[PDB]
Swiss-Prot record, chain B:
It comes from Plasmodium falciparum (isolate 3D7). Belongs to the eukaryotic ribosomal protein eS30 family. One of its GO terms (biological process) is translation. The lineage of its organism: Eukaryota, Sar, Alveolata, Apicomplexa, Aconoidasida. The gene is RPS30. Component of the ribosome, a large ribonucleoprotein complex responsible for the synthesis of proteins in the cell. The small ribosomal subunit (SSU) binds messenger RNAs (mRNAs) and translates the encoded message by selecting cognate aminoacyl-transfer RNA (tRNA) molecules. The large subunit (LSU) contains the ribosomal catalytic site termed the peptidyl transferase center (PTC), which catalyzes the formation of peptide bonds, thereby polymerizing the amino acids delivered by tRNAs into a polypeptide chain. The chain holds residues 6 to 48 of 58 of the full protein. This is Small ribosomal subunit protein eS30. GO terms for molecular function: structural constituent of ribosome.
Length: 96, 43, 60, 185
RNA sequence: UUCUGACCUAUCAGCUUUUGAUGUUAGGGUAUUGGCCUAACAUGGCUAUGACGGGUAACGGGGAAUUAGAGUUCGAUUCCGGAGAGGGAGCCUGAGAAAUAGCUACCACAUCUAAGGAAGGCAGCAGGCGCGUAAAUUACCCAAUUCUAAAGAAGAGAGGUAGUGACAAGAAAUAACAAUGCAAGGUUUGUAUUGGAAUGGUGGGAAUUUAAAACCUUCCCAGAGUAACAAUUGGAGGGCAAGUCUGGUGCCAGCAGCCGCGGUAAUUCCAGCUCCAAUAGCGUAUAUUAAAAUUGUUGCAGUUAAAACGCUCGUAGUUGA
């Protein structure tokens, strides 16, 4: 569990063009800042600027994944609601 | 930063109602239907 | 009974006389029978009252 | 402390998910024997495989070996009880020869379909779940009961079933008709 | 107390002996042997076959997962044994204790107090806070299982029984069937109209079960047709089983384990439709085993791909007509 410090826009490696929406989170345990990936296009505005994210690994252990350089972690539940559940269809509660 | 164009495509697309349809089969019944549609009459 | 009915398995006892029934069976089994009623109903609040007691703190 | 009652997996997941030839074969097997899930096939497959493993171990051991003669005979006798091997065969290579349709052929639903009663494998399966069947002296609702040879002679209807002549018909319709007849008359 | 058996580390190589290290003698001490402890005397003991250190997110074993066979990882956790009761230390009683719901003190915490003083230790069971990725009722009962007693009859949060419980594991529904009409086959097999049977789930009552109740099972009433008593999850280029289907977007948004896809026909996005895999279970993450004969004893590679010491002698090692 960590808290969102800043919302960042990482640019891809050479063969692809996009701006990838990422989230800088400070883990509660150790006071460590890391950059985490957020799936889903509406999801950048599904986190507030001082919110609680539940962050996980990203399918590869510490290895960089796909386009993103330097991103080792992924957000999978926000405001203690599941990110995917909110995204998919709106099957579960919005932000309060 | 160039952040706030986010959510573009989902916002843009039309939204469609998901219709009715007669109950898709469970279980044995679904397996029997699959068996017929793949293997029986064909020839 | 066991599945599908028409059959019932149990366990039975036949004592020499009623005095034997008084002798060698415990109270719930007697209650189940209908020989005597269920006794005192304090439960484990009895334990709480017991531990409320401390010897020679009160005259009793 | 933890309970001393044991428990175990019935089945082993198949490995290599999408292998076409195997997949189509499994569907074909379902088509013939009326099973709900790939899981039913897998448990039966696992059961056969264990038998095959045991028999394989036994056949490695030498002839006249005391353990071998005892265990091999015992396993084979168990196969005879199950109805997997005929009378003429009595040797461990026919145990190895056991094969998955041959085992499915000993399901209770299959046995009913063969003997009659129902008009379809699917009809048999629902008939068994809806409590109409009896092995004689005992009643059962499990379509994955396997039939032993001495019990193939006593498949019947359940005596508390409609077909057994219990409560005889649809209460709703018969009452409605009787009430209407009394009112009308 | 004999013997024998262990993880990682040499960027830990000399350790141990004034302060007992190794031995001899004599004592003291112990329940008893003993440097166990005192005195006197020896000057030893251990070490590349890895001592002495350091690390361990290390209690040990019975065992567990994964294995074709070798194996590799795991073992707080049902049994056995050890250790400990906030941190250390010291004690009494008694057959048994350096005991923690015995005691004394200190330190670290901390409750009541009219301030003089007093009382305190949940890693028993509940329950709370905090920590967190991460975890249940301040339940009922001593009937069984056993224990303790001046032993039937008393006690026991030992223990049982429920409650919470998608941790795992097994069994198992979500229709079945006949008529017709249509479809394809040489009176058949398949599939849209109809329409009588079969039944749990469910509601109620019992019978029963039970320490007591609840559940289970069993029986009697009720009691499906859009059987709305409504199956989901994740997918559909390849790897990899299923779409060169229909709209929107237009290098953006995004997807994408990996290769890659997206710049106006997108077989990959966002939808819809269809199809597919598994199914009351199915996704995701992290760890771990196989796959890995990519740790290689079995069983690798070293001319050129990673890799023969510059060369020789040689001690330990291993191997030896």
């Amino acid at each position: 569990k960590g808290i969102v410090v800043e919302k960042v826009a990482i640019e891809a490696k050479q063969p692809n063009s996009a701006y990838r929406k990422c989230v800088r989170v400070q883990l509660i345990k150790n006071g460590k800042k890391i950059t985490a990936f957020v799936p889903g296009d509406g999801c950048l505005n599904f986190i507030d600027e001082n919110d609680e994210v539940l962050v996980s690994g990203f399918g590869r252990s510490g290895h960089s994944v796909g386009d993103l350089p330097g991103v080792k972690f992924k957000v999978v539940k926000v405001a203690r609601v599941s990110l995917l559940a909110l995204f998919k269809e709106k099957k579960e509660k919005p932000r309060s | 930063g160039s952040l706030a164009r986010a959510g573009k495509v989902k916002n843009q697309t039309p939204k469609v109602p998901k219709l009715d349809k007669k109950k898709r089969l469970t279980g044995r019944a679904k397996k029997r239907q699959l068996y017929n549609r793949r293997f029986s009459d064909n020839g | 009974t066991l599945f599908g009915g028409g059959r019932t398995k149990g366990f039975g006892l036949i004592y020499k006389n009623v005095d034997a029934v008084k002798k060698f069976e415990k109270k719930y089994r007697l209650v189940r029978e209908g020989l005597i009623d269920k006794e005192t109903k304090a439960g484990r609040r009895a334990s709480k009252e017991l531990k409320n007691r401390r010897k020679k703190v009160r005259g009793t | 402390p933890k309970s001393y009652r044991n428990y175990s997996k019935t089945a082993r997941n198949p490995k290599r998910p999408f292998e076409k030839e195997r997949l189509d074969q499994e569907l074909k097997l379902i088509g013939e024997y009326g099973l709900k899930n790939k899981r039913e096939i897998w448990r039966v497959q696992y059961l056969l495989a264990k038998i095959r493993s045991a028999a394989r171990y036994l056949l490695t051991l030498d002839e006249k070996s005391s353990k071998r003669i005892f265990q091999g005979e015992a396993l084979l006798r168990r196969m005879v009880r199950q109805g997997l091997l005929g009378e003429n065969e009595e040797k461990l290579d026919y145990v190895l020869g056991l094969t998955l349709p041959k085992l499915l052929e000993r399901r209770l639903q299959t046995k009913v379909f063969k003997l009659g009663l129902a008009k379809s494998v699917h009809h048999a399966r629902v008939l068994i779940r809806q409590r109409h069947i009896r092995v004689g002296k005992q009643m059962v609702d499990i379509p994955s009961f396997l039939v032993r040879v001495d019990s193939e002679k006593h498949i019947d209807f359940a005596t508390t079933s409609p077909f057994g002549g219990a409560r005889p018909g649809r209460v709703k319709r018969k009452s409605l008709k009787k009430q209407k007849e009394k009112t009308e008359a």
